[PDB]
């Protein structure tokens, strides 16, 4: 039997994904989340196929970016693990929670 060490095949992913450009959310759950929030905001609305991805591209690139900043927050606390406490600090300094 073989076993990978904890937090070390983790890296294989990071590099792999940092190399790739593609969307890390399946369009459909996202599609569902978008259409929901729009109707939960204005009754019966349609969306250009482009418009949905456009949003996803935006959405992800943001999280992507947020996480980067959240990363450093952890490391600053002499920590290794990201937690609500970080995102809080991240968003508060950014100015969206400030």
């Amino acid at each position: 039997p073989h076993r990978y060490r904890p937090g070390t095949v983790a890296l294989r992913e990071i590099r792999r994904y940092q190399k790739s450009t593609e969307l890390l959310i399946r369009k459909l759950p996202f599609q569902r989340l978008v259409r929901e929030i729009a109707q939960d905001f204005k009754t019966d609305l349609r969306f250009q196929s482009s418009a949905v991805m456009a949003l996803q591209e935006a959405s992800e690139a943001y999280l992507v970016a947020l996480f980067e900043d959240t990363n450093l927050c952890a490391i600053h606390a002499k920590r290794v693990t990201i937690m609500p406490k970080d995102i809080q600090l991240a968003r508060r300094i950014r100015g969206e929670r400030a």
Partner: protein, 80 residues
């Protein structure tokens, strides 16, 4: 019903990894979803405000982009 929970915990960590992320808490995945919702809400809100103004019933890519611009998230690649 919980399409916000449709943003899969792996899809979350995949996005996290891309940020250069080594260790991820269980509490994160919820917090994240929250933030995303907030983000989306804010965008879509403004996005629709345009669709609505155009006297249109279909949300265009332009609407989505003009909203992102307003937000200070200037998007490239959709006629933006």
């Amino acid at each position: 019903r919980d399409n916000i929970q449709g943003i899969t915990k792996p899809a979350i960590r995949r996005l996290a990894r891309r940020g250069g992320v080594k260790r991820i808490s269980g509490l994160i995945y919820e917090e994240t979803r929250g933030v995303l919702k907030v983000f989306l809400e804010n965008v879509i809100r403004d996005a629709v405000t345009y669709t609505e103004h155009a006297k249109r019933k279909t949300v265009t890519a332009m609407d989505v982009v003009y909203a992102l611009k307003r937000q200070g998230r200037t998007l490239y690649g959709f006629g933006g």
